[PDB]
Amino acid sequence: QHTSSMRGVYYPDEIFRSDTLYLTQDLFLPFYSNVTGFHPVIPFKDGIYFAATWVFGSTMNNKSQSVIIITNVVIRACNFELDNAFNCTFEYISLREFVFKNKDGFLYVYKGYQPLPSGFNTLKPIFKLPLGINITNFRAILAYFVGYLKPTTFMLKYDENGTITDAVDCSQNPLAELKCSVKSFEIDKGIYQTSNFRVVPSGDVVRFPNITNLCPFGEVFNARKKISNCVADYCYGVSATKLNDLCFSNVYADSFVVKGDDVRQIAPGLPDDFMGCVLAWNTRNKYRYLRHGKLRPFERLNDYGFYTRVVVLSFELLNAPATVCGPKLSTDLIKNQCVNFNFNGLTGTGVLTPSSKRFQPFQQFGRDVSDFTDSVRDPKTSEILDISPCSFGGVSVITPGTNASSEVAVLYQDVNCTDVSTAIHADQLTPAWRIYSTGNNVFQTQAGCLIGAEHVDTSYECDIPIGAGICASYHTSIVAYTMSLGADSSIAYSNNTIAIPTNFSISITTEVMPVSMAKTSVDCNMYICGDSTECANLLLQYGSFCTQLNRALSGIAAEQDRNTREVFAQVKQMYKTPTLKYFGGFNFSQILPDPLKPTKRSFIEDLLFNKVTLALICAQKFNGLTVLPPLLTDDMIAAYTAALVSGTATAGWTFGAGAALQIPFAMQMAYRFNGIGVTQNVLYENQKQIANQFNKAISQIQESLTTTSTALGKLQDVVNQNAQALNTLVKQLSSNFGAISSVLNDILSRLDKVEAEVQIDRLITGRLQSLQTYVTQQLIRAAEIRASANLAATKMSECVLGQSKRVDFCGKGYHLMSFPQAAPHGVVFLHVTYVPSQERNFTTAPAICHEGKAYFPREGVFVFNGTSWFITQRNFFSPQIITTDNTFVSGNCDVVIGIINNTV
Amino acid sequence: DVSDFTDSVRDPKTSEILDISPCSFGGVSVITPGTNASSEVAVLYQDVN
Ligand SMILES: *[C@@H]1O[C@H](CO)[C@@H](O)[C@H](O)[C@H]1NC(C)=O
Ligand SMILES: *[C@@H]1O[C@H](CO)[C@@H](O)[C@H](O)[C@H]1NC(C)=O
Ligand SMILES: *[C@@H]1O[C@H](CO)[C@@H](O)[C@H](O)[C@H]1NC(C)=O
Ligand SMILES: *[C@@H]1O[C@H](CO)[C@@H](O)[C@H](O)[C@H]1NC(C)=O
Ligand SMILES: *[C@@H]1O[C@H](CO)[C@@H](O)[C@H](O)[C@H]1NC(C)=O
Ligand SMILES: *[C@@H]1O[C@H](CO)[C@@H](O)[C@H](O)[C@H]1NC(C)=O
Ligand SMILES: *[C@@H]1O[C@H](CO)[C@@H](O)[C@H](O)[C@H]1NC(C)=O
Ligand SMILES: *[C@@H]1O[C@H](CO)[C@@H](O)[C@H](O)[C@H]1NC(C)=O
Ligand SMILES: *[C@@H]1O[C@H](CO)[C@@H](O)[C@H](O)[C@H]1NC(C)=O
Ligand SMILES: *[C@@H]1O[C@H](CO)[C@@H](O)[C@H](O)[C@H]1NC(C)=O
Q1: Residue among A16, A20, A526 whose CB faces B25 most closely
Q2: Which residues are sugar-modified (chain A)?
Q3: CB-based contacts of A495: which residues, under 8 Å, 6+ apart?
Q4: Distance between the two ends of chain B, CA-based, in angstroms?
Q5: Number of helices and strands in chain B (H, E)
């Protein structure tokens, strides 16, 4: 008894594929399965996998056709006695692994070779024998290992040469299904939703009226009559073969004598909404053709003159208690377990329990507020409600990313979480992993079971989100905890204490915005209804949908160019680079293009293009999909941002409104300090320190971009969303929406010109719907991008071309400056802000009065220091002597505290 | 191919020739001064060699 690690993979067809992932369903050998060694007849069971380092039959006797295989190969399907060569029809004369498969009479044979150990090797087809026999047993002919094939889906990987170089079993692990669902081998960290789940039924329940009798169903035919309280044995609304499983009430038979000349007059065109069964029979071995007006259905002169019947059965159902129906062995009642229903006329599935609903005596069924059957009356007069189909929901897999581990936890969304545990170990769940264990269960507050994660008591910053307040993470086996909102802090409030900063720092932070998206086009008549005319004529009937679709996509494309134009083309003149790149003590390189390099992009703007990944020639595909080019090249968009930075460096604020006015860039930074409420002396006395902080902040940005993981996250999301929408549209062309084939020229080549028009219509309607869905969702996406481009144009005017007082609009501090940089399908702002720090404590008063005259500070607050009172600004400590020019007087000090002999 | 188009065939008489290229198709657009200045126009055949 050994294990088959990854053995038994073969090419499923004879079609060449290269560099792709292909999902298929067929009989395969599950990974890490049980393989029975041999160091003896063996059952077949719909296929086997055979190795070694054959005779096929049904009874291994003379009464059952058998087969024998054997570089001279002899395949002879004859009743060889186990001297017998009779009763046979087929003859054929011309680490090793073999696969055997019996289907539709043919017996397929695959074979491989390699000079059970570990590894995987791929087999190829050899024979396909139309034996057409029944194979259940076999025996070897003389260290051979036997597997078994089961219906499973695999994901097979091809390479450039078209060789199967890997596979995945999509029913082995939760991770294996996750890989199979997203169609990849490496998976990022996160939580993904996958196939649903549902508890499988547990039993069969039947309840029929206990009345038993022999029915006159036969007497009436050979001789309007009613039949009731019998058991018949045995079409316009029912199938004859399906009549012996439904229970009716008072089946009626209409009988009369008419020759075959009038049988073709009894049918609708008999009510129009009613059903029934009609029989007729002739043997030859009155009527009215005059009446004023016709008759309503089911209501009641010459002679036919017979010379040498029609029974219209009517069925009434689900109205009164069931009394007429065929043989059905009853069953006992089971409650509180997902079972099957076969009540009088209600076949379903669910959970039963006693009810508390006051049925009226003349009622037998129940209904909800939405017309669902949430109650029933047992044929033995009992009210039991069949609430819900036991259980179902969704399944989500939590993974750290497959780059750090292969351990995952599984969440079941909406379950009491005790039913799941019972079904897992009872083998009662449709998602059936071959290798999966349960060690511990946590019940999320409202998100259901969590299996594979251990609860911890501490709290962290919610790596992966789950449920309501409960998140999960790997480093913190994976652990599930409760969210932590932040750091608890306290402040001692008082009435005569204030805090004033005594130092600051320069901070530069980045901001990423998308402004545009891909500009695609379609060829309506080529995507649908390809290079053909029989189909092209059929598509003219659907009005002019193609013209509508082309107009909508042309509107989106022309809008993307307005987006980029509105954000960047905000300068009237193209200022040349100052060819100095050192102002005051500020280093402006790495944001201005280098003149000694080929590409005219700044250093920081070159790292942004190496972060986002997308994966004349003039290539074209068969599907009619294409992407148009932008109007502004990447070298023109980069010339706009270099002009904007050059204008800010020299001439500062006043470019745009008016004409650019020079300024040495050290005088304006002083002016930018007055905006945030700090005097000029602060800059001019600490210019060297401030310049150092500026240069360091830029360097950290450059280093971070080089060695980060995801800062251009929003720009990548736009690329992924557009590629996912096109891939869905392309893969919808390999789908047959009801026709026998999904490719034209395969039904257009085998046609009758009467039957091929119905399948072509099936594809046309299916492909038109998929096109409309693509256009609708692109219109919604394009409106969301327009919102982000409108905001980016506001930030260019208010953060780059000026100074902003709106709180936290540009940056996070006080917004000295801001520089733009170009990114693929986006823009990056670098906000330079001012951050005070190093608080101190002081004593303060509202006002000061000298000689009965109060003195309020014209601008600032009063402080005490430790020796004498002073007046200072709020954002920086710079005490000043209290004089008559800092203060002003208003009234007498009767409600304002404090006094000192320091004024004037 | 992915969309169940052949895109490549084997010559019965010992060769393999690419069916991929579906020759040329696209959309045409007309550039006009506006039937007022003049009546001469230019045509753009999009995505062709
Ligand atoms: C192979 O059979 C043995 C014996 O029952 C069993 O313990 C083992 O789990 C089987 N292999 C696998 C992969 O399940
Ligand atoms: C099989 O052989 C027997 C004689 O052993 C013969 O009677 C019978 O017809 C054969 N079955 C056929 C021909 O289907
Ligand atoms: C394809 O096969 C050739 C020779 O058999 C080999 O040189 C080449 O590397 C293979 N393809 C790849 C992608 O390696
Ligand atoms: C019933 O009989 C009356 C007698 O005049 C007749 O007018 C009427 O049409 C009949 N019913 C129907 C449905 O025609
Ligand atoms: C508020 O501050 C005043 C000093 O101006 C002090 O006298 C008073 O006690 C304070 N209120 C308190 C401590 O509740
Ligand atoms: C302000 O902080 C810088 C470093 O961030 C330091 O070098 C400087 O001495 C500080 N100034 C004061 C007045 O504390
Ligand atoms: C500006 O920084 C670069 C490196 O980022 C350095 O090579 C250059 O010398 C600095 N500026 C000046 C004027 O040196
Ligand atoms: C156009 O066709 C010529 C002829 O072979 C070829 O050399 C050229 O590369 C083609 N151009 C494009 C854009 O396909
Ligand atoms: C300022 O005083 C408050 C309370 O008086 C105290 O909580 C805080 O730590 C002090 N901070 C400094 C920088 O002195
Ligand atoms: C502020 O207080 C400090 C410490 O008490 C003192 O050294 C300094 O001289 C004071 N400032 C004045 C008196 O202007």
Answers
A1: A526
A2: 34, 62, 87, 134, 161, 210, 222, 403, 416, 495, 503, 587, 841, 865, 901
A3: none
A4: 24
A5: 0, 4
**Chain A residue numbers touching B47 (CB-CB < 8 A):** 618, 620, 626
DSSP state of A629: P
Contacts of A2 by beta carbon, 8 Å cutoff, 6+ apart: A35, A37, A116, A145
* Contact call for B2 and A731, based on CB within 8 A: yes
Ligand at minimal distance from the CA of A594 is: 7
Please indicate the experimental technique that yielded this structure: cryo-EM
Distance CA A785, CA A783 (A): 5
**Residue A878: exposed, middle, or buried by beta-carbon count in 10 A (0-12, 13-18, 19+)?**
middle
Q: Is A233 left (phi over 0), alpha (psi -120 to 50) or beta?
A: alpha
A772 by DSSP, 3-state: which? helix
A295-302 contacts, C-beta under 8 A, 24 or more apart:
A297/A270, A297/A271, A297/A272, A298/A270, A298/A271
Question: Which positions in chain A touch B1 (Cβ < 8 Å)?
Answer: 622
SS3 content of chain B, % helix, strand, coil (to 5): 0, 30, 70
Mutate to test the pocket of ligand 7, among A587, A591, A703, A705 (most ligand atoms within 8 A of CB): A587
Distance CA A354, CA A366 (A): 14
Alpha helix positions (H), A707-803: 713-731, 756-795
By the 8 A CB rule, do A33 and A147 touch?
A: yes
Is residue A89 within 8 A of residue A71, CB to CB? The reply is: no
Q: Quick one: tokens of A61?
A: 């006797």
